[PDB]
Structure 1
Amino acid sequence: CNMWVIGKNKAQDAKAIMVNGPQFGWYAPAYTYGIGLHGAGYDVTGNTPFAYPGLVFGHNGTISWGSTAGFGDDVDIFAEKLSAEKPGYYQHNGEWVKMLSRKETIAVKDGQPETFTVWRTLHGNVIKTDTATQTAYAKARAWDGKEVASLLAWTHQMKAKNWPEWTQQAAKQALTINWYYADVNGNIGYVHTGAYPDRQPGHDPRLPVPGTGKWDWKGLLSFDLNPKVYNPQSGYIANWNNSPQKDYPASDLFAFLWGGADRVTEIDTTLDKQPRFTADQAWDVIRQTSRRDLNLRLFLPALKDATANLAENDPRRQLVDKLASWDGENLVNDDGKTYQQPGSAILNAWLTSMLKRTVVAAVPAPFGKWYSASGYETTQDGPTGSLNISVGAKILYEALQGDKSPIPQAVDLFGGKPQQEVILAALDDAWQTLSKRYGNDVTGWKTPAMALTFRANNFFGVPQAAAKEARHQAEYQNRGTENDMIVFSPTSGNRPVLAWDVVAPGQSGFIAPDGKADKHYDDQLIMYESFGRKSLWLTPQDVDEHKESQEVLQVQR
């Protein structure tokens, strides 16, 4: 998920601009729902995943809000001690305590039902049991018991009208989520929200701990410690699921790292340089990031260094020289099927070889393959989510910085050989594979373009539409599932706020019994790829100006 928020000093012809690109994959009907709410203290517009009560993306006339995923470590695993002489009991504080258990039966259409038991301890649900070691693994969540509290906090923030009132809700949000704020006055703010555990000293939160009692959480840390910033001296707030704050620890997921190499640097770079940003320019960052090869920046220096003393004709050099000629932005050809430049394919091949030669070779099977991915792996139907710098890349990158990296290299990932020797070996491999496909002239390489699929299955992998309803976009774009922009105090417009969104494939997923698609089934699909947008309406006037249909119900209780 990405976002950039632009303050008073950095905005141009406006006081603040907030651009939001949540990444949840692409689906049909659309992942998020468009909705306006007016009454009972609420005056809001925007859109929101699965039509939650609370709008995760929107504004109320005075302020606007948004989100990107936090990835703080708010889950730990407790190793519960059991005895073979007591089914359903675990030891805690010197006494044997009963597990909670419920029975579930799964009804199967045209099939025999299956029944099983869910177990639960003090710390949480049981996720696995190893009778051999007489241990059970229980998953403790800091946000446990605060799920609906969090639902409601999302909703009540929509009423807030300044930083104080809004942070009061942020503090009641327990899921590990990044929260963003902008207002009419041109103030901007950020809060890395959530419940986070107060751990015992010496608790390594990347690994399990005993659940026998001495390693139980002290409690939850206060909101006071959650990373936050209001009107920073930078003038902007930028995020792409990167670290919120220096020395803040990330999720314990092995495949997830905040390090020297982070894709957010692609946004930082655009935003620095231009001292100010109009609305159009701020929305145009999406296009730019959509197409940015994320790896070029990280490795081209090492590649240049490595191939300097080769002959100009050496094919390995022809590859690096060609990358050096590239602006690192991918565009499709007129055929609608190949990339104008072959740079991504090159980096992929090289990196794949590079990783096998370094990180993977340092990690025992069957674990090394956790680090073998380049970040470009796809099929015809395209990536299913965002593109990123792979775990392996990030670890490699630290090795290439050598002494410049803060991470001590306990193992030399280059096996005591110069980095240069390995880099070349990998270039050789890439050249070998690519020339065999495309021939010996890099200028005549038409590499495959990544495509985009609006899937008929939801992210659970459960059908939410008929297979036919799935939709194909020629060009993959490393952008939000939706995008929205809110502009504050536009010096041009009459109104105090302007806001746009795009909900592809369209607002409705309704198909009549005879098969007639709604008029709003598909009407934002082409707008999405175009980098287009539609206006969002708040005021009763503007909502009346652009009406199409009107229904009135008499309800009670």
Structure 2
Amino acid sequence: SNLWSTRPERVQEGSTVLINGPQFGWYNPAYTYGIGLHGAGFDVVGNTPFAYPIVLFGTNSEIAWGATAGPQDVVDIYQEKLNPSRADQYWFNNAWRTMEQRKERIQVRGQADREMTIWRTVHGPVMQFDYDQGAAYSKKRSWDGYEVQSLLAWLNVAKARNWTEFLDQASKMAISINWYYADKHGNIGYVSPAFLPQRPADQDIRVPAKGDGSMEWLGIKSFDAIPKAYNPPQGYLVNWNNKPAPDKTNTDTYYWTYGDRMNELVSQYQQKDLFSVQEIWEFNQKASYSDVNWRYFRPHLEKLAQQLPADDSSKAALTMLLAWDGMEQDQGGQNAGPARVLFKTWLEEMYKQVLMPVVPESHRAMYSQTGFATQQGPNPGSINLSMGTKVLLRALVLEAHPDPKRVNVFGERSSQEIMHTALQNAQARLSQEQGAQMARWTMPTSVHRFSDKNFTGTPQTMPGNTFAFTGYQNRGTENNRVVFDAKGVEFCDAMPPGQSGFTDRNGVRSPHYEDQLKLYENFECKTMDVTHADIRRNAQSSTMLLIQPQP
């Protein structure tokens, strides 16, 4: 999920522009639903994922707001020392403790009802039982018991009119998430609200904690610990699932390095001084088709061709890979150019030479993957630097800056030696695959797909009902743009394939089923009515409902 905010001081016409692209994966019908709520204190306009009473992405004519994936740790797993005699007892403080159990009844169509038992410890519910090791893993969450509080805090942020009313609502948030601020005055802000626990020095963040009473939470950390950035001297705030702020250690699930997908958006800001609204919108144009892991390997490939002897062994594809701008180019397709194909197979051979010897058999698939977009294979809703690539990058600096305390994964062989061997192995693999002719090498272009089944593995529609177009775009599922001109409020959103997910008994579909699909492909954007004046003028249909509740 990517978001980049701009301050009027960095904009030509002097308007606050907030563009958000949250990526959850592309599904049919649309993942996000557009709504404009007016009255009872609320005066908001925009769209929200699934169907939540709250609005994640939109504006209230006073301030806009975006969102991304949570980059902070809130969930810890504790390993309880199980009794060697009894399975339901665990060692907690002094002495033994019995687990709590509750029975859930699963209803199945065509078959009898299935029954299961869920065990619970002092920390939380268990996820995995290991009987031969004598340890059970329980899941303790910091946001547990504060589900509705985080739901309502996200709701009341729509009624807010300033940064101080934006910040105190974030203090009520328990779940790990990122919030973004942009007002009509010209101010932009960022906060990462979460109920952060204060862990002891004995506890390692990457591995499970001791569930015996010796290693427990000291308490919930204060709000001052939560990272917050309001109006940076640079005049822009960029976040693409990257690190929250400097001073925060890596979580158990997310690991970051100097090579990050954030640099794909930020590098566009260090070109010109002032950008127009149309130009800032065209940041998504380049970031979608640009390669993520190209900016960091290119300097490490320049010192290759030279002073490397021009004896043509190989240097055949190495000199060409340099003429690559790091972009997907369709022609058939079929990628226009053998540069991406060679670079893909080069990285795959780099994992074989360095990582596979040290990485165990079970976790070998976590580092062998290159993390590239493909035509047929089920690719994720967001393309990233793979864990195999991240280790290669930070250890490549370790040769330039030696450290005795750390161990080098390259070991005996230098950087230039391994990168040469991988280049020879990549060329040898493609020579027997697509012929000896180098110029004719090409890989099938990645197809952008809208799957009928959602993220969790449940069909949202009938099987087969899918939309697909050639050319994978590293965008969000929904792209919103809030521009605060001198007028000055303009909301513009784009969500494929459309608003209505209705299909008639005969087979015909709603007119608002495919109306936004073609608009999304061309990086275009639709205007949405914000104020009470123009909504009654640009209305297509009106329906009045009647309610009679009992207070």
TM beyond 0.5: yes
Structure 1 residue 299 and structure 2 residue 280: aligned?
no
User: Quick check: 2:375–2:444 contact (8 Å CA) kept in 1?
Assistant: no
Q: Secondary structure at the match of 2:317?
A: helix
Q: Secondary structure at the match of 1:320?
A: coil
User: Quick check: 2:74–2:197 contact (8 Å CA) kept in 1?
Assistant: yes
Find the counterpart in structure 2 of residue 259 from structure 1.
Answer: 257
Read off the aligned partner of 2:513 and give its amino acid letter.
Y
CA-to-partner distance for each residue in 1:462-504, whole Å, 9 max, x for gaps? Answer: 101112221111110011111111111x14xxx3211111110
Find the counterpart in structure 2 of residue 540 from structure 1.
Answer: 532
Equivalent runs, 1:109-148 vs 2, <5 Å: 109-148=109-148
Find the counterpart in structure 2 of residue 521 from structure 1.
Answer: 513
User: Quick check: 1:239–1:264 contact (8 Å CA) kept in 2?
Assistant: yes
Equivalent runs, 1:185-334 vs 2, <5 Å: 185-253=185-253, 256-310=254-308, 312=310, 314=312, 316-333=314-331
- Residue 65 of structure 1 deviates from its aligned partner by 0.5
Structure 1 residue 420 and structure 2 residue 416: aligned?
yes
Q: Which moved more, 1:204-213 or 1:231-240?
A: 204-213
Q: Aligned partners of 1:293 and 1:7: how far apart in 2? A: 27
- Residue 382 of structure 1 deviates from its aligned partner by 5.5
Task: Calculate the TM-score normalised by the size of structure 1.
Answer: 0.94
Q: Secondary structure at the match of 1:468?
A: coil
CA-to-partner distance for each residue in 1:313-342, whole Å, 9 max, x for gaps? Answer: 736422222121122122322x3x222233
- Residue 421 of structure 1 deviates from its aligned partner by 1.3
Q: Report the CA distance shift for 1:408/1:115 in structure 2 as closer, same or farther (over 3 A).
A: farther
Task: Calculate the TM-score normalised by the size of structure 2.
Answer: 0.95
Structure 1 residue 449 and structure 2 residue 445: aligned?
yes
Q: Report the CA distance shift for 1:94/1:84 in structure 2 as closer, same or farther (over 3 A).
A: same
Read off the aligned partner of 2:357 and give its amino acid letter.
A
Q: Which moved more, 1:377-386 or 1:545-554?
A: 377-386
Equivalent runs, 1:498-517 vs 2, <5 Å: 498-517=490-509
Read off the aligned partner of 1:131 and give its amino acid letter.
Y
User: Quick check: 1:332–1:340 contact (8 Å CA) kept in 2?
Assistant: yes
CA-to-partner distance for each residue in 1:216-238, whole Å, 9 max, x for gaps? Answer: 11121122111110001111100
- Residue 404 of structure 1 deviates from its aligned partner by 5.0
Q: Aligned partners of 2:138 and 2:9: how far apart in 1? A: 49
Find the counterpart in structure 1 of residue 153 from structure 2.
Answer: 153
Q: Aligned partners of 1:525 and 1:313: how far apart in 2? A: 52
Q: Aligned partners of 1:122 and 1:107: how far apart in 2? A: 29
User: Quick check: 1:290–1:477 contact (8 Å CA) kept in 2?
Assistant: yes
- Residue 377 of structure 1 deviates from its aligned partner by 5.8
Q: Secondary structure at the match of 2:37?
A: strand
User: Quick check: 1:398–1:405 contact (8 Å CA) kept in 2?
Assistant: no
Find the counterpart in structure 1 of residue 105 from structure 2.
Answer: 105
Find the counterpart in structure 2 of residue 28 from structure 1.
Answer: 28
- Residue 6 of structure 1 deviates from its aligned partner by 0.8
Structure 1 residue 376 and structure 2 residue 372: aligned?
yes
Q: Report the CA distance shift for 1:276/1:442 in structure 2 as closer, same or farther (over 3 A).
A: farther
Read off the aligned partner of 2:215 and give its amino acid letter.
W
User: Quick check: 2:373–2:472 contact (8 Å CA) kept in 1?
Assistant: no
Read off the aligned partner of 1:517 and give its amino acid letter.
R
Q: Which moved more, 1:508-517 or 1:437-446?
A: 437-446
Q: Aligned partners of 2:130 and 2:285: how far apart in 1? A: 50
Equivalent runs, 1:69-88 vs 2, <5 Å: 69-86=69-86, 88=88
Structure showing the higher helix proportion among its residues: 1
Q: Aligned partners of 1:197 and 1:519: how far apart in 2? A: 50
Q: Aligned partners of 1:302 and 1:23: how far apart in 2? A: 31
- Residue 310 of structure 1 deviates from its aligned partner by 4.1
User: Quick check: 1:382–1:476 contact (8 Å CA) kept in 2?
Assistant: no
Q: Report the CA distance shift for 1:17/1:208 in structure 2 as closer, same or farther (over 3 A).
A: same
CA-to-partner distance for each residue in 1:495-536, whole Å, 9 max, x for gaps? Answer: 321111111010011001121201111111111111111112
- Residue 95 of structure 1 deviates from its aligned partner by 3.7
Consecutive unaligned residues in structure 1, runs of 5 or more: none
Q: Aligned partners of 2:292 and 2:405: how far apart in 1? A: 24
Q: Aligned partners of 1:157 and 1:485: how far apart in 2? A: 19
Q: Aligned partners of 1:553 and 1:46: how far apart in 2? A: 22
Structure 1 residue 395 and structure 2 residue 391: aligned?
yes
Q: Report the CA distance shift for 1:133/1:382 in structure 2 as closer, same or farther (over 3 A).
A: closer
Read off the aligned partner of 1:374 and give its amino acid letter.
T
Q: Which moved more, 1:428-437 or 1:447-456?
A: 428-437
Q: Aligned partners of 1:179 and 1:543: how far apart in 2? A: 28
Q: Aligned partners of 2:40 and 2:311: how far apart in 1? A: 73
Find the counterpart in structure 1 of residue 475 from structure 2.
Answer: 479
Q: Aligned partners of 1:511 and 1:140: how far apart in 2? A: 43
Q: Aligned partners of 1:345 and 1:313: how far apart in 2? A: 24
User: Quick check: 1:15–1:185 contact (8 Å CA) kept in 2?
Assistant: no
User: Quick check: 2:22–2:478 contact (8 Å CA) kept in 1?
Assistant: yes
Q: Secondary structure at the match of 1:467?
A: coil
Q: Aligned partners of 1:533 and 1:142: how far apart in 2? A: 39
User: Quick check: 1:399–1:409 contact (8 Å CA) kept in 2?
Assistant: no
User: Quick check: 2:77–2:208 contact (8 Å CA) kept in 1?
Assistant: yes
- Residue 126 of structure 1 deviates from its aligned partner by 0.6
Q: Aligned partners of 1:175 and 1:407: how far apart in 2? A: 38
Q: Report the CA distance shift for 1:401/1:84 in structure 2 as closer, same or farther (over 3 A).
A: closer
- Residue 99 of structure 1 deviates from its aligned partner by 2.5
- Residue 211 of structure 1 deviates from its aligned partner by 1.7
Q: Secondary structure at the match of 1:244?
A: coil
Q: Secondary structure at the match of 2:389?
A: helix
Q: Report the CA distance shift for 1:71/1:472 in structure 2 as closer, same or farther (over 3 A).
A: same
User: Quick check: 1:361–1:368 contact (8 Å CA) kept in 2?
Assistant: no
Q: Report the CA distance shift for 1:144/1:408 in structure 2 as closer, same or farther (over 3 A).
A: farther
User: Quick check: 2:61–2:530 contact (8 Å CA) kept in 1?
Assistant: yes
Q: Report the CA distance shift for 1:406/1:196 in structure 2 as closer, same or farther (over 3 A).
A: farther
- Residue 412 of structure 1 deviates from its aligned partner by 2.3
User: Quick check: 1:454–1:471 contact (8 Å CA) kept in 2?
Assistant: yes
Read off the aligned partner of 2:229 and give its amino acid letter.
V
CA-to-partner distance for each residue in 1:389-413, whole Å, 9 max, x for gaps? Answer: 1111111011222255698773322
Q: Aligned partners of 2:131 and 2:464: how far apart in 1? A: 47
Find the counterpart in structure 2 of residue 174 from structure 1.
Answer: 174
Q: Aligned partners of 1:430 and 1:118: how far apart in 2? A: 50
CA-to-partner distance for each residue in 1:384-443, whole Å, 9 max, x for gaps? Answer: 311111111111011222255698773322231121111111001111222333334443
Consecutive unaligned residues in structure 2, runs of 5 or more: none
Q: Secondary structure at the match of 1:297?
A: coil
Q: Report the CA distance shift for 1:438/1:161 in structure 2 as closer, same or farther (over 3 A).
A: same
Read off the aligned partner of 1:544 and give its amino acid letter.
R
CA-to-partner distance for each residue in 1:112-152, whole Å, 9 max, x for gaps? Answer: 32211112222111111222333221111111111111111
Q: Which moved more, 1:371-380 or 1:349-358?
A: 371-380
Q: Aligned partners of 1:53 and 1:405: how far apart in 2? A: 52
Q: Report the CA distance shift for 1:366/1:81 in structure 2 as closer, same or farther (over 3 A).
A: closer
User: Quick check: 1:4–1:238 contact (8 Å CA) kept in 2?
Assistant: yes
Q: Aligned partners of 1:483 and 1:79: how far apart in 2? A: 42
Q: Aligned partners of 2:311 and 2:283: how far apart in 1? A: 38
User: Quick check: 1:68–1:241 contact (8 Å CA) kept in 2?
Assistant: yes
Q: Which moved more, 1:311-320 or 1:70-79?
A: 311-320
Q: Which moved more, 1:58-67 or 1:365-374?
A: 365-374
Read off the aligned partner of 1:302 and give its amino acid letter.
H
User: Quick check: 2:338–2:440 contact (8 Å CA) kept in 1?
Assistant: no
The alignment yields a C-alpha RMSD, in angstroms, of 1.9
Q: Report the CA distance shift for 1:111/1:167 in structure 2 as closer, same or farther (over 3 A).
A: same
Q: Aligned partners of 2:443 and 2:310: how far apart in 1? A: 23
Find the counterpart in structure 1 of residue 458 from structure 2.
Answer: 462
Read off the aligned partner of 2:494 and give its amino acid letter.
V
